[PDB]
Structures are given as structure tokens and as C-alpha cells.
Ligand binder design. Structure first.
Ligand SMILES: Nc1ncnc2c1ncn2[C@@H]1O[C@H](COP(=O)(O)OP(=O)(O)OP(=O)(O)O)[C@@H](O)[C@H]1O
Ligand SMILES: Nc1ncnc2c1ncn2[C@@H]1O[C@H](COP(=O)(O)OP(=O)(O)OP(=O)(O)O)[C@@H](O)[C@H]1O
Ligand SMILES: Nc1ncnc2c1ncn2[C@@H]1O[C@H](COP(=O)(O)OP(=O)(O)OP(=O)(O)O)[C@@H](O)[C@H]1O
Ligand SMILES: [K+]
Ligand SMILES: [K+]
Ligand SMILES: [K+]
Ligand SMILES: [Mg+2]
Ligand SMILES: [Mg+2]
Ligand SMILES: [Mg+2]
Lengths: 524, 524, 524
């Protein structure tokens, strides 16, 4: 359609107006004194959130050029959320500061390309300095502090996340879901607990618990789906001769085979329980093989070549305990080779490295957590759905921040790491004066998060920033107590990954934004 | 529908207004000091680009006659992008200059047809002079300089493209795709690496790598799809007698045949791996034949006449190494006749010459790069998607410019080649004074790119153009450093093909545009 | 009424837009190649003029802030017209250039007050350098060149003005009026020619000429008005005894006195002619006293004390010749003391110095021109009234420029004097960097007149300015011939007063304009 074209100061001014609208909606959420933003939803009640990414996602302006700027600067928060899951508001603040200072420089007549190059050089040096300044975060105390800070100072959330990570270990998985109660609950399950229940309610050995409990049972892992008892009769006869119980993991057991297994279950010749194999095509086989590796068994398939009529007790797997319920199947202490379990885990790790999809890699990591480590569910407790959504967002931010901290370490919070980095980079220079000015605007924007935190607390951002800069190391300003001190000692920690990601994405977007001279959009 | 008709100076003025709108949106991107244009997208975030073709494609005006002019002059950028992949902004600037001067001449009362004829004669002479002035660009240093200049002075992009061309050779292929990391990555694969993985995960000889590795295996190339082991049993028996591994390239191996091959793979009688043939109908056969030529084998087909029961070891191909993964199959050092490989490559070259489709010719060239030469992928590294798009556009422009340079050579950049060409053509004359004036306006427009570069740098275009014209040879003006010198020595090079294509397309469109006396469009 | 208030870049941008509208309407008139502007008049036909002051006076914009800027920058042209009567377009161009560069500096973040101070310092130094570079313009050839240049190269106007000044001398007066013919006419009258005709038509001594001609007559200067012959009878009797004619200069002669004088005129006893005294109250007495000083007589008044009955021949003045017509009275070679005439002229000069009104000082200068020197009228010849107005404006500009040249000298035209002044002031510095930048913008704007002249001629302003700056002394660019040479030799001269006044007024207005941060106006 017909296009409105704007040039020079007019287009840049409208772009900055939109960026400022979005960043002003977002930055009110920054800091422990940060406020909440209510986002109207066309469906359901409004969402009250302290997430800059959510606020930015909702922002959209009538003016096409202002909306253009808002959309461009919203990529910063979106990318920060995608990568680190935290620091979206900080990244938006950094992008707004960089855009403002760079547009000042552009109106000053400096080359926008050189300003962008200087910003990029300053940000690269700042990332290197952040890596140097970062310290490993392996202690549960530091992890709890990081989670508490990322959850808007919810010590309960921080300590719960620390406990969950301690329980599940390095290779473990943690997920966040809704809770029925008012309190946050942690549910940790070890080993395999794939979500497949008994195929027949009459397999229940223990009625008062409504669950099948097998002690030292064999495990028969069948890739095919079975409807007749003939193909398995040798296996059931061998199991009955052995005397121990049996668990079948199959695509489907139904009809004559299922009925015969059930009848034998009452008759007591064999304590047999059957369940569906977990997952679906091209993943069911993988999970069956992981169970085989855990239990020291082999998967019976037609592709592999073996037949069920020829299956033997040695072919069958072994585990110490098994608990089936209507919902989930759990195998406890599968009798399998530890070297083999680690080899399979390494293969799944290689698959995760090869993977390029978030869903694929998280499913692979869930498989790793089932094989080794454990799986934890944090049920967020809230009285209402709006509170549930807000607390779930905060808990997810805390979990993401803790993962970032373990992955890349921690730095002083409250915008102190960026302040120190800029102080170290004061001597940095570019190829020309425009690049030097770009470096300087990047360094000055590095102070934007702390200044915005102070502003939201209501104090004087310039005074606080000057005091922090005069300080050294981890010395900083506590927004909660409105005092100064060592941020590490006070427990105000930010993941180095979060800070670096915010800086990087904000710098890229803001540099390209300031390099703009024309804006083309649809007419009103 | 009812039509608005405009005549003479009014129609030409509206046409020029639209052309000027488009060219003003586009030309701000010209030069190292050129700025970026933000294009609103109805879907997704706005696109920040320095590409005149993209800007022109987005341009569209409310006024029907202005939009008419914009659309006509947009063909210049579109055709330049299609042919050379670079110089779109230069072509648009040239078209705008030619249109402006020619419309001045038309208002001056000269014959527009004679002006167009003079412009065409001047452009033909200018193309001949560009060919004379061009120098071959075979050195990796010149290639890197060309890529760096076309990538808005990204030495990293230039050197990466130079390395990729050095690795893949003349007949090699290079493509540009998105990258997950922040840095630009180069991935070069030699020989055949068609994207077909193992048909059965259990073929993996090396589990820690999750890949099949065959040393000196035979290759059985089957055009048909196979589901039974009977037709192949003689071949498998011969292979087992030989003792070396075997790779099957077929339309599909499934069911009994696949299962038997897999079972034999564990049993160790024959180290057999099977994969799908690459491509689809009417291309699968061609790629199978190229693999046969590479490996010194023969393709088994029903059309050709041979049967698989009668296939022999001599019929089977031979290669030194083979590596299969879930994603791709790679054959290393196929034992085939070099004369035959060159003959097949020449046949594919003849097919490329006969081809009239970009997709067909690029697929044929990919086949050539698989047979001989190699295939390179440049994964563009960017922190955000907008930066990724901008950097990918710049890298594609650099790759296109480097290909143009190798194809047709290089000339002095910064609008210096056109300046020198016009100086050489100062004595050119037409059949009449109107043709002479058309020649003169074409020559004056030849200076438009340099003047626009200077204007974007903020200096005085007339002074810079006068100094460059007073200079001789490759003497020019460095927009980046705002100094004068030998453009070749400074590394400011433009492909002769890019310059010639921009000039030619701009001249054709602009001449026809100035020859206009009436414009017919839909009413508002 | 309610007010719209605008701040910062928005207000300055609107101010600059209005200034640019006015300056663009005005600057098309600059140069020998300068064009004419047609100004619609609510009454009468439109006025075609090449006067920047007239164009600016007519300019008025719909937007209140743009109109604000236009009105402020119109003061420059108005003040230049009031002071020098020429250089209005040059002053407007200088103001526009200063405003543009200073607003660039302001957007650059420099202090507007310091920019204004630097501009003022640069302009003071430039005025001093203009005074140093100026050369006296006392030769009629230089005067004619100046007039020709100021009349848009009308050699006829220049030579006519040179002849008029040569005739009337230094203390003479020149005025411009409409002419009935197609050719410009010069009418010079020496001595006293006050516009008072014979009180009675029958005084005509020469009927074929319809005028009174008296040879060596006495002059009776009466401050009172007379209606009876008794008070004068002794004087008439003495005159009749003497035998020479008599001229009465009185407030009014009527009734019995006039009738008796007329009757005696026929009877021939006394050749008496009577006329009204010139001017009105508080000026009639002064002009009567100047006539008395010229003719060596005394004014008869009641305030002074003498009575007409006691007046004598010695009291009566003496002159060599007298010519009265219905329109004007002229006295030729009044017999008065030269020392006295110079003393009265010096007294009138002191009165001119004390005077603070243009009308008062021009009337005093007319009295000086009547006493000594002469009075010249240039009747502008034109075929139509529009041509008459245009040519009269050009002739008035030429006269003002010639007066400025005699008063303060001449400098090289075509914007060369300002170029040389800026070159000399290149080393000038202020108290701070903002003042230095203000100096630099003033120096760059000093080049604006030459660049605008070149632009109106259609050539390259930057190239022409560079060539002129590379030149030295009076070397410049001839807009008429589009060649370079010594402007003095080519006859392209501009009054130093005109150039200095344009620079000063433009600098003052532009500095104050750039020092603006808020604009308050009425709402739309
Ligand atoms: N008590 C505190 N004193 C000082 N700074 C604090 C304190 N608590 C938190 N902060 C800082 O507040 C900053 C912003 O945290 P917040 O969770 O509000 O937003 P964010 O990290 O920018 O992003 P998101 O909106 O995605 O959660 C963090 O950098 C943290 O360092
Ligand atoms: N440092 C430099 N000095 C002088 N000229 C330069 C310099 N760098 C690039 N140029 C010139 O800039 C001109 C424009 O390059 P640019 O990549 O901006 O646009 P283009 O080639 O017209 O088209 P496209 O928009 O499709 O990339 C090229 O002709 C190149 O010669
Ligand atoms: N032949 C010429 N070559 C170069 N410059 C010339 C020539 N003739 C005139 N000029 C310059 O043209 C400039 C502008 O003259 P012009 O009479 O058009 O306007 P002005 O002096 O700015 O003001 P005004 O509009 O009040 O007359 C003068 O400075 C004069 O020096
Ligand atoms: K927040
Ligand atoms: K471009
Ligand atoms: K003028
Ligand atoms: Mg947070
Ligand atoms: Mg390019
Ligand atoms: Mg003039």
C-alpha cells in the first residue's frame, strides 16, 4: 500500500518517541522497588506482571513510526527472554539509553556507522570484562540469593529453587507449574517416572494405595504392540518358573494378551503388570532403549531382529523396585551397568548439542534427567489466578537466573557490574572520534540500569551512580534498603549471562536503530 | 475503471516527484557513510537494511502518477539485484540523475527519443570503456577487498568470503545462512555430502559419534526402492565374501530388506549401511549417476535393463571412505576415473548453459560442486534477528560482488570508474544535437554515484567530483577516510559487472521514462 | 489568548522552516542572474521586484512558529534597507546561513549563548577587516560602476547617478521620482529653487515663457503676511528710485497690497513680483533666513523687532538673477557673503547631527543643497507602471549604494569581500570551544552570498567558493560572465557600508534566533 516516508531528525524523533513509550512502560518494573504493569487481555482478566518482556510484547502504538521504534526495541526484550529468561527490563533500559545517547550523537553530526562500531567494540570489551569479573556460582547459598533477587526478593522462591537444584543435581531438570495450594510446593522424582499408568486397573497389588508395587521384578521391553499371548507365553512361563514379578513396557497390550496377564495376576502364578511405552514415534524407541540401559535389559523389536517367542530371562531387564499408578510408572534402582548408563547419557548429550530446537533439547534433557539425576516440579501457590501468573513469572525468572548463574557465574547486582566494566573500559578507543563517542555512549548507557533502579526507588540516580563509581569492586547501592555496601555480601547478585545478554542484545538493536536515516511505513 | 490522464510537464513532474521520493529513500544508504533505512513489515519487527533494492521494493506512493514513477524506477534496483546482486543503490542514483537531466532537456524542447538514443549510445560506449578499464580479479587479496567494500567495509566478511572461495575453488558453491552464534562461521564440505542420513539408527558403527564410518566400502546404487532381500542377496553374499563394508544408495530400503541388512550389521558378516537416494524424480537419477561416476560404479535401474540379482562387485562402486550421520551422507575419495568425472562435469555445465531457470542452474552448479570443488556455508553471526537480517544482506551483497568480480573483473570504486569513463567519452557524439545532449546527460549522471557518496559523507560533491576528474586513472576519493588516493591501493574496488549492470539498467529505464509524454492511471 | 508553547528541537525546526521560506523567496533575487518575485497586492496590480526587503515584508506564514521565524529574520532585511538601502537579499542570505549553521551547532549540544558570542566576535573582527580592506570611492567611474551593479547591471542608471553626483557635489541632494517618458531623465537645479510660484499671473514679464524674469533685483524677505500697501510703501518708493526690479518673499501678499504691486508692475514704475515664503511654521523662518544669507539681506519680522515701514535698500537683499514661474521660484547668484553662507551651512550641518528623524535630516540636507551644492531629480522612464516600480526600486538601490560608497568606500563584490574577511579571520578564537564554533559558523556563512549567487547562476557554489578562496585579494567570480577575475577591474563593486550592515544585522538577528529554546505564540 501507499507508504509514508520520513527522513533525518523527524524519523529518528518518532522512532525515539516510540522507544521511549515502550521503555517507560517497561522500566517501571525494574528494581525491588519496581512496580507492576497491568496488561489488558482480549480474553480473560488483565495480567499483572513485573516482566519487561511481557510489557514490551503488549506495547503497540498508533503512530506508525513510533510503533516501528517500539517493535525494534521490543526485539531486545524478546531476545533477552529467549536466551537468559531474565534481565529483559535491564536490556530494554540499556537499549533506550544507547538509542538516546546515540541519537544525540547523530544530531551532533557524527557518523552513525562509526557510532555503532564504537558501541559494538565497547560491548565486546564489556563482555570480556564481565567474564573476567564473574565468579563461579556453585554454592547453594549463592544460588538461593540469585533466585531470591530474580524473584523480586522472594527468599522462599530462592531457597526452594536452591533445594530443587541440590536434589536433582547438575543433569537434573526443573520445571514450574501451577499449584492448587496457597504455598509453593516442590515435588522431586528420581530415576524414571514416565507418565504411563497401568493398562488394567486389576493389576493393583496394593488396593488401599491404588497402585502396583513390584519388588525385584523383571522388565520386558517390547517395541511392538501385542494382542495375543502366544508370542509372550515362553517369557511368562520363564518368569513364573523364576518366581519374581514382571513389568511389561509395550506400545500397547490389549485383548487376549491383556486379559490373560490380568487373570494370571489374580491366580498368582505370575505377578505381572503391563503398561504403555512412553512417548511417541522416534522417541518411544529412544526412551525404551534408555529404560533398557537403566535396567540392564534389551528392547525386543522387529527391526532389531529378535522375536518375543525367543526372548529369555537374560534378555529381560532387572530392577530393584517398581511402582505403577493410574498416572505414572516409576522404576527404582534399575539393575544396569553404570558405564552403560553414562555412555547413553553422553550419547543424549551429543544429541542435545546437535539439536537446534528448544523442544527437542528440553526433551533430550528430560531423558537425561530420567536416566541420571532427577526431575523437579515447582507448583506455585497463589490465592488467585492473577497472583498465580505473577508468582509463576517471578519463579520462572528465578529458575532461569539460577541456571544462567550456574552456567556462566554471577556478578554484582544493581547495575554495579556494568558500572565497573565501564570504569575499566574508560580508556577504550576506536579507529576515529565517532567510534570513540559510540564507545562513550555505550559506557554511559551501562550506567542506565542502576540509575533507573535508583529512580524507581525515588532517590537521586546521579548521586547514587557517582557514589557507586567512586566505590570499587562489588561496592554498590541496595535499592531495597536504600543503603550502600558490598552487593555480594548483601546477596544482590545478577547472572553474568543475564547481564551480558542484556548488554549484547540492547547494543545490537540500539546501534542499528541509531544508524537509521529513513523510515518507511504504511500511511495512517 | 475511470482513468486520470496527465500530459506534458505535469505528468513528467509527478513522475519525477515519485522517482525522487524512491531515490531519496534509497540513496541515503549509499557509501560507507551511508545510513540504514527501516522498513515497516506488516508481519514481524521492522527490517533495518542498507539495501537500495529492499527500500525501493517497499516504496509505494499515494499519488498514482508519483507511484507510477516510483514503480518504473524500482525496476532498476530490482534488475540490478537480480543480475549482479549489488549496486542497487548506485543504479537507482544513476536512474534518478538520468531522469532529472533528461527531463530538464525535455522541458528544454529536445526530442526525448533522441535523448534516449544518445543515452543508449553513451551507455554502450561506457560499457565498452568499463570492459577496457577492468582488470582481472583472481587474487584472494582483491577478492577480500571487494567483499569488504560490498559488506559496508566489513573486513571479516571480506576475508571469510575470500577463504571460502579459496577452499571451494572455481567450480565450488557458496551459500549464506543464519548462524546460532555471534560470530560468522564458515563450514566447507568437499566431495559429495548429500543430505540423506542412515535409514536405520542401528547402522551406527561408532556410537560415541552417532555415525556410520565405513573404510574402503563398496557402493551399490539402486534406482528402484527395495523391500525384499532376495533381489540383493547375491550382492550381499559377494560383499561378505570380499570382506569390505557396503553402502546402499537407494530410493528406499524398508521392511524385510532393511531388517535383514541391520541384523547382518550386528552379526558382523557384512558391515552394511543403507540410505535414501538424494533428490527427487528426474534429479534423483542424475545425482545417482554423478555418484556412480565419482565412485566408478553403475546405477542399477529397470529402465537401463540390469537387475539387482545380476549385480556384481565390478558393478558396485568403490570409494576410500564413507561417513553417514542422521543428517547427511558423505563419500570421501570415490574411486572413479578422473576423465569420466570431468566429462560428467562438462555435461552438467552444458545443462547449466541450456538452463533458463535460476533454481535449475543453481541446483546444477551444486551438483558440479559436489562432483568436483566443494560447498561452503557461511553462517552469519548476530545477536538479534534484525542484526542477523542486516548482516546477512551485507554478506550476500559481498558474495554477489565477489562472484561478479571473478566473472568480469574489478574497477575503481567510489564512482571513479564511471567518472573516468565519462571523461573518455567526452568526445562522443550522436546523429543530432538532441542525441549529443542525451550523451551529455548520461555522462553527467555517471558522476552521480560519487557525488551522492560525498553528499552522504557530508562534504562538497562538486568539489570532490572536480578533484577526481582532474585526477587520472584510479585516483579517487575515500569516503571512509575523507581523503584522496588510488582506490585500488586503498582497497576500494567495485565489480565491473556491478557497475556496468547498474549503468545499463538505469539508462534503459531512465531513457524510457524521459521519453514519456502521457501518464494514464486510475483515479484517486 | 491561549498560547501554544514549543520547546527545543521542535520550536527551532519550525523557526528554521519559516526562516527558510522567507530566505528562499528572497534569495532568488540575488545576483545579476537573480530572478524577480511577484508580490500580490490587495490593491492594484501585483508588484514585480528584485528587492529582498520587499519580498520579506510581504512574506507571512500560516504556521505561527514558522511565521515567528520569518518575522524575526525579516527584521534583517528591514534594517538593512533602512540603514544602507541595499544588500537586503545578501543580509537575508547571511542570516539564513548563520541560523542554519548555529542551529546545527545547537543540536550538536553547544551553548547557544557562546555560539552567539562567537558570532558577534567574528562579525566585529569582520567589520574591522572590511574597514581595512575598503578603498575610498571618490572617482565618478567607480561611482558609476557601483550604481550599475546595484541596479542589476544597468550601466545607464549607474552613469546617470554618477553624472548627478558630479553635478550636485558632495553637499548636493539627489531624489528619484516617476518619469513620463520611456527614458531615464536627470533634472539638476542649482542654488535656491523653492516650490513657490508667482502670487499673481500678471507679474509675468515674459509672456511667451509664462514666467517672471528679473535682472539684478532686490529681495524683500518678510516673515509676516501683508494685505496693505502702507507698511511697504517706503520700500517700494526706494526701489522705484533705485530703478532695479524687486522680488517679495512673504507669508502671503493679497488684497490691496497685491493689487497695488500688480498695477505698478504694468505701469512700469517698479518691476515688482511677489511670492509666498517657502515651507511652513518653524521651517518657513529658517528657509527665509537661508535666503537672506544667500542674498546678503535681512528678514523683516515682528519677533526680531524691525518694521517694514523702516526697511531700507540696504536691508533688502540682492541677487544677480531671478526666475519665477507658476510652479517654482529660483534665485541665481545671490549677492551674499561666502563666509556667511558657509557659516549657515555649518549651522544646518550641526542641526542635522542633532536631528534624530529621517524626515528632519533630509529636509535639513535639502536646505544645505539649496544654499550650496544643488538638487537633482531622476525621473525613471518606463513603459508601464510595473516596470516603473521595478526600475525605480533598482535606481533607489543604486543611489543608496553610491551614497554608501562615498560615505564608507567600496569592496570587491560578488561575496568576495566577506570571503577574504573570513580567510583573514580563520585564526580568530573565542573564550571557549562553543565561541570558536560560533566564529566558524559566522565565517562559513560569510561565504553564503557568493554561493547563492553561483547557485542562482546555476553553477557549482562549492567549486566557485573554493576557487575564490584559493585566489587572493580582489580575485572573484563574475556571475554575469560566469568567469573569474579581479572584481574591481571588472567593475563588480559593493559598498563597504552595505556589506558591513548586512553582516551586522544578519549576525545580530541570527545569533538571537539560535539562542532560542522556547517559542510562545497564539494557538491555531
Ligand atoms: N535489593 C536490591 N538492591 C539493588 N538492586 C537490586 C535489588 N534487587 C534486585 N536488584 C536489581 O534489579 C535489577 C532488575 O531486576 P528485575 O527482576 O526487576 O528485572 P530484570 O532483571 O531487568 O528483568 P525481568 O523484567 O525480565 O525480570 C536486577 O539487575 C537486580 O540486580
Ligand atoms: N571507503 C569507501 N570509499 C569510497 N567509496 C566507497 C567506500 N566504500 C564503499 N564505497 C562505494 O560505495 C558505493 C555504494 O556501496 P553500497 O554497498 O552502499 O551500495 P551499492 O553498491 O550502490 O548497492 P547495494 O545497496 O545493493 O549494496 C560502492 O560503489 C562503493 O564503490
Ligand atoms: N556581475 C556580477 N558578478 C558578480 N557578482 C555580482 C554581479 N552583479 C552583482 N553582483 C553581486 O550581487 C550581489 C547581490 O546584488 P542584488 O542587487 O541582487 O542584491 P543585494 O545587494 O543583496 O540586495 P537588494 O535586494 O536590496 O538589492 C551584490 O553583492 C553584488 O556584489
Ligand atoms: K522488571
Ligand atoms: K546501499
Ligand atoms: K535582490
Ligand atoms: Mg528479573
Ligand atoms: Mg553494495
Ligand atoms: Mg542590490
Amino acid at each position: 500500500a501507499a507508504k509514508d516516508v520520513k527522513f533525518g531528525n523527524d524519523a529518528r524523533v518518532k522512532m525515539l518517541r516510540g522507544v521511549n513509550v515502550l521503555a517507560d512502560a517497561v522500566k517501571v518494573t525494574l528494581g525491588p522497588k519496581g512496580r507492576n504493569v497491568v496488561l489488558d487481555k482480549s480474553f480473560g482478566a488483565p495480567t499483572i506482571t513485573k516482566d519487561g518482556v511481557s510489557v514490551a510484547r503488549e506495547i503497540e502504538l498508533e503512530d506508525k513510526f513510533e510503533n516501528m521504534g517500539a517493535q525494534m526495541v521490543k526485539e531486545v526484550a524478546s531476545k533477552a527472554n529467549d536466551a537468559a529468561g531474565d534481565g529483559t527490563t535491564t536490556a530494554t533500559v540499556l537499549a533506550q539509553a544507547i538509542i538516546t545517547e546515540g541519537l544525540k550523537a547523530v544530531a551532533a553530526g557524527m557518523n552513525p556507522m562509526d557510532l555503532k562500531r564504537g558501541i559494538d567494540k565497547a560491548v565486546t570489551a564489556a563482555v570480556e570484562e564481565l567474564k573476567a569479573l564473574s565468579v563461579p556460582c556453585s554454592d547453594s547459598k549463592a544460588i538461593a540469593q540469585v533466585g531470591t533477587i530474580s524473584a523480586n526478593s522472594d527468599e522462599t522462591v530462592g531457597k526452594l529453587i536452591a533445594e530443587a537444584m541440590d536434589k536433582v543435581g547438575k543433569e537434573g531438570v526443573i520445571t514450574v507449574e501451577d499449584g492448587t495450594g496457597l504455598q509453593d510446593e516442590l515435588d522431586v522424582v528420581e530415576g524414571m517416572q514416565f507418565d504411563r499408568g497401568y493398562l488394567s486397573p486389576y493389576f493393583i497389588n496394593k488396593p488401599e494405595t491404588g497402585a502396583v508395587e513390584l519388588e525385584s521384578p523383571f522388565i520386558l521391553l517390547a517395541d511392538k504392540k501385542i494382542s495375543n499371548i502366544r508370542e509372550m507365553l515362553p517369557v511368562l512361563e520363564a518368569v513364573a518358573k523364576a518366581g519374581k514379578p514382571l513389568l511389561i513396557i509395550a506400545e500397547d497390550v490389549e485383548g487376549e494378551a491383556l486379559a490373560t496377564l490380568v487373570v494370571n495376576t489374580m491366580r498368582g502364578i505370575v505377578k505381572v503388570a503391563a503398561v504403555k511405552a512412553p512417548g511417541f514415534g522416534d522417541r518411544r524407541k529412544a526412551m525404551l532403549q534408555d529404560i533398557a540401559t537403566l535396567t540392564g535389559g534389551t528392547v525386543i523389536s522387529e527391526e532389531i531382529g529378535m522375536e518375543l517367542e525367543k526372548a529369555t530371562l537374560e534378555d529381560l531387564g532387572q530392577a530393584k523396585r517398581v511402582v505403577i499408578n493410574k498416572d505414572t510408572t516409576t522404576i527404582i534402582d534399575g539393575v544396569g551397568e553404570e558405564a552403560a548408563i553414562q555412555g547413553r547419557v553422553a550419547q543424549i548429550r551429543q544429541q542435545i548439542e546437535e539439536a537446534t530446537s528448544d523442544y527437542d533439547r528440553e526433551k533430550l534433557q528430560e531423558r537425561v534427567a530420567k536416566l541420571a539425576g532427577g526431575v523437579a516440579v515447582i507448583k506455585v501457590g497463589a490465592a488467585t489466578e492473577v497472583e498465580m501468573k505473577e508468582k509463576k513469572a517471578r519463579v520462572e525468572d528465578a529458575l532461569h537466573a539460577t541456571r544462567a548463574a550456574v552456567e556462566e557465574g554471577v556478578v554484582a547486582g544493581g547495575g554495579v557490574a556494568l558500572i565497573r566494566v565501564a570504569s575499566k573500559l574508560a580508556d577504550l578507543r576506536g579507529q576515529n572520534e565517532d567510534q570513540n563517542v559510540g564507545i562513550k555512549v555505550a559506557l554511559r548507557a551501562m550506567e542506565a540500569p542502576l540509575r533507573q533502579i535508583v529512580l524507581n526507588c525515588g532517590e537521586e540516580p546521579s548521586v547514587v551512580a557517582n557514589t557507586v563509581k567512586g566505590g570499587d569492586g562489588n561496592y554498590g547501592y541496595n535499592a531495597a534498603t536504600e543503603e550502600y555496601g558490598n552487593m555480594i555480601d548483601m546477596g544482590i547478585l545478577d547472572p553474568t549471562k543475564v547481564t551480558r545478554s542484556a548488554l549484547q542484545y540492547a547494543a545490537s538493536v540500539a546501534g542499528l536503530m541509531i544508524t537509521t536515516e529513513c523510515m518507511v511505513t504504511d500511511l495512517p
